[PDB]
Symmetry: D2
Subunit: 260 residues, 4 copies
Amino acid sequence: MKKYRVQPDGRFELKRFDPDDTSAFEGGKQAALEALAVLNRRLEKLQELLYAEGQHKVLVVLQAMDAGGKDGTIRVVFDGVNPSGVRVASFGVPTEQELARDYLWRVHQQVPRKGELVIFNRSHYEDVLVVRVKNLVPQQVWQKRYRHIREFERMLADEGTTILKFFLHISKDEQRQRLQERLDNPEKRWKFRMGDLEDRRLWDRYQEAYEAAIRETSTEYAPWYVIPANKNWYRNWLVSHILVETLEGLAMQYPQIVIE
Amino acid sequence: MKKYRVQPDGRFELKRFDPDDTSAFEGGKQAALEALAVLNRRLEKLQELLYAEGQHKVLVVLQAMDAGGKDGTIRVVFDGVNPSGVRVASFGVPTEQELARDYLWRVHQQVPRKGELVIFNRSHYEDVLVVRVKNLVPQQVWQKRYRHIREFERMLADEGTTILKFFLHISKDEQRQRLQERLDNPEKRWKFRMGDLEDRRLWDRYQEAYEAAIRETSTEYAPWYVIPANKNWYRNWLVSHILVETLEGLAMQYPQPIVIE
Amino acid sequence: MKKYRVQPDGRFELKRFDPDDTSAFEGGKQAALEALAVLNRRLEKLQELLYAEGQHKVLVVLQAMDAGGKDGTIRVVFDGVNPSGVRVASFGVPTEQELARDYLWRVHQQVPRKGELVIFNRSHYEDVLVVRVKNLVPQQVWQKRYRHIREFERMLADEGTTILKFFLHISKDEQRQRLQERLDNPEKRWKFRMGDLEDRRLWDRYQEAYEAAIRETSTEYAPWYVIPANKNWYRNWLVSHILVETLEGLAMQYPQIVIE
Amino acid sequence: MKKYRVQPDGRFELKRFDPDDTSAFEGGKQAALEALAVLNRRLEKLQELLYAEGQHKVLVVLQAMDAGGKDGTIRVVFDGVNPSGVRVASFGVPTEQELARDYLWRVHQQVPRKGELVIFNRSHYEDVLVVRVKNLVPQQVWQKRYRHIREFERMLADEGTTILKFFLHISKDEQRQRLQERLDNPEKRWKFRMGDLEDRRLWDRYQEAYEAAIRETSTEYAPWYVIPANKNWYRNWLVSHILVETLEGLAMQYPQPE
Ligand SMILES: Nc1ncnc2c1ncn2[C@@H]1O[C@H](COP(=O)(O)OP(=O)(O)O)[C@@H](O)[C@H]1O
Ligand SMILES: Nc1ncnc2c1ncn2[C@@H]1O[C@H](COP(=O)(O)OP(=O)(O)O)[C@@H](O)[C@H]1O
Ligand SMILES: Nc1ncnc2c1ncn2[C@@H]1O[C@H](COP(=O)(O)OP(=O)(O)O)[C@@H](O)[C@H]1O
Ligand SMILES: Nc1ncnc2c1ncn2[C@@H]1O[C@H](COP(=O)(O)OP(=O)(O)O)[C@@H](O)[C@H]1O
Ligand SMILES: [Cl-]
Ligand SMILES: [Mg+2]
Ligand SMILES: [Mg+2]
Ligand SMILES: [Mg+2]
Ligand SMILES: [Mg+2]
């Protein structure tokens, strides 16, 4: 499953990853759901170790094109995981208070504490994504941010954070269908804003911004994983597999008279 | 079912509530687990609505004697509920930073935002519970806090927060059993604190504190519910039933705001 | 003196206070500057004691019509007072993050800690002032906020905060000059916004809103002081006098071997 | 006066700086007080411009041995500077909440916003000073923090923060005198705690930690200035001079009318 980890060699090409690829799983939807159920139970048990051990900090970063599966991933991968140990931090349009400090200030506040698993639904990456695509700052400014990010993540990792960054990779046609389904669904119509169409006109610019971001910031201490995400069953299984394998590697353990 | 809601008449008596009572459910463990499963799936759907609508703020307060079932309630009642819309805020021993401001400062920071459901695992109530029982401040100080709490909760309710306060009611013997079990299971021995034996010695002073707190702060806008909690199946079913009924009462609606090329 | 303290009898009338009144000081500008210098030194010494003792919390609330003297007051009254123990919290246009919680959430965060003196340059009062005048919430909502404020302040006072609320009272004509002077001064033009003309146009609505807010919230534990503020020398002297006397009343004490 | 700026060449030696040196000022205490009053007035005007312009963020870091003059510097250098635009963030013993996140979390929280001047009375540097001296984390951990600090400061500078870091340099004998004076003055005894004496026993370890920290983190974007601080008048004048010169270099402008 190591074929999805982006090596720190600055030679990453997004074209080498197909959103419709399901090659790491030897079967289809039904076999994958059973396999996911097994991983989800292991994940619940690994989160229990993390929380009780209270040493490690786990950071899961989710990034994708609009309708790329960020909410779906959280919902399904973390299903049944103790709410006391799992937290979501969503990053939207910066406020005036947030813009008055460096772009990393609002992000650094939300980092996981010891024994905690945090999911960034969007992140500090938006500052080299939407900011780059829509030229919210000049190139001279945002080009320097790749180093800021590598060094911020190095500090986090050195200080005890396990970082997993998932790029949920969907195709242009898959986004068109998901966006259309969001229009033609009254319980999902709320997720759709008009702005989702302008970001859609900028598809290629966003793909280029993603490629450069992933190429510049995938490191040994903070890897990027490209998740083919056109098939939700595959996306959910693969994210769970990578997460569970990473947590297993930490080799966490539980810590070390008659009541009247 | 809402015979468990404490009326704002200042006549609340904890003796009228039996921790072993299961009278609101016409059956036992197995039927209640099926009933809970149904409520849990309704809760998942009601949370999706709350988040989507993004107007209401939901605050669930959990208070109990040690080993009274606070963690158990969170894990079971909120099982499968989207992590993006549900948050737990735990209140422990105040830090120097927290003590340097009023007791409500650390609590007010954690309140739910619009479209969010927040669980207070312990709360601002500890400032009329452990503080009163262990005399951390004089009576002159903590007696004034019942009003502070009523008025803080009124402000929260008026400004859009739906407040549900659950007192998970267990018996003295049930506590004896639960701490003993926790002090035996090696995967749970980490939960046990030596301080739990001094708090058990003050059982009666904590029961009196709870009675006073519940009597003083159960209001129309922020009710207290006494949950008989010796039977976990009953405690989980009843908390889910009360929560689901409350969210259904909000009559939440999905927002309403072309061919993609 | 106590002639400026608004009694908690719900009979407050702003008309009884003249912005041009200087009756509490037996002299003019020059004698009051010397008197202010004496109070300012006492204030520096009282702040040093407050910080050292580290037990009391002091909250100074400043409210006024636009150009009413809030900045001028901070600058002059707190001149030379140690920056380590004096903090300003300015309340501007609420952000989306701030609006997503109750109006008191952003305000409660900024309250003074033990040994600290905090100045609210605008405050939670804006939630019964601009909010009321411009109908940012319905009357049914903001009318309930007077009680919220009394009860919030009661809690603060009961828990150890000394609360002083100053309404810097200027006349309509004094504001017209000050606003105009702000337009004509290139080192002050930045303070002017087009919205200030809308706020000037609503003078009477704001005066009504101030009268109702002062009448509803001036209590024994959190008094309002109406400061005639057309004369800056008088405004600065009177605010310093009230503050110094209040801090002296606290009877603060300093907390209580050969080096090799 | 560029003799006090630590060049980014990794060759810094604290022994080359005398706490009793006053060579940059051609006079004594009384002429310096007048000179300081002139600089203080310029500083009040530069702060007004910073706040009005609302674009730059100014970070002043103060580090010293105990009784080295951090509070005195804040009090005198920033005397009369508008409280609305100047803020002090003091860094003490980390709480359990603070220790549960990386050491930079509590520090990053306090960084200046646009139009603001912030003074760090102690800072993120403590995490390579007291932490190193008392081995609160192993060497393997704190040795990596010099890079974290350079890169955190680079990010801050690139994103619009002007950083000035002042090491207020006093001698071992000056600290003995000042610590004694603190125990004898009843309005200053509160500043003294017993721990300050074990910190004095560890004088040499702290001097080595300071030398290493300054050598590792003095950069073009975030320089360290060694301030001979045995003479308060000289320390106050020199810090004001460096600060005023730095702010003047920003060539701040009042906002363009609407
Ligand atoms: N740093 C940033 N700068 C500008 N816009 C940002 C930044 N971070 C996030 N955003 C934007 O905030 C929006 C969040 O969208 P939203 O509908 O609330 O959530 P999501 O689409 O992830 O479910 C996106 O349009 C995203 O581009
Ligand atoms: N306001 C407060 N003042 C004093 N102690 C408090 C306060 N709030 C909470 N506590 C105490 O903090 C402790 C939290 O216990 P902990 O083991 O961390 O969690 P829990 O037992 O709820 O699982 C309890 O002993 C509780 O009495
Ligand atoms: N609660 C609030 N709701 C709406 N607007 C607010 C609120 N609090 C403050 N404001 C507004 O924020 C603005 C702050 O103005 P600004 O020019 O930044 O400062 P000031 O005029 O006090 O020097 C004012 O127009 C004020 O009415
Ligand atoms: N990162 C840190 N780790 C450990 N101790 C720290 C840290 N930061 C600051 N401290 C300690 O906190 C204490 C603050 O001392 P205090 O008397 O409150 O202030 P000061 O001496 O600066 O006036 C010092 O002993 C300092 O070493
Ligand atoms: Cl699917
Ligand atoms: Mg969207
Ligand atoms: Mg204005
Ligand atoms: Mg904000
Ligand atoms: Mg000290």
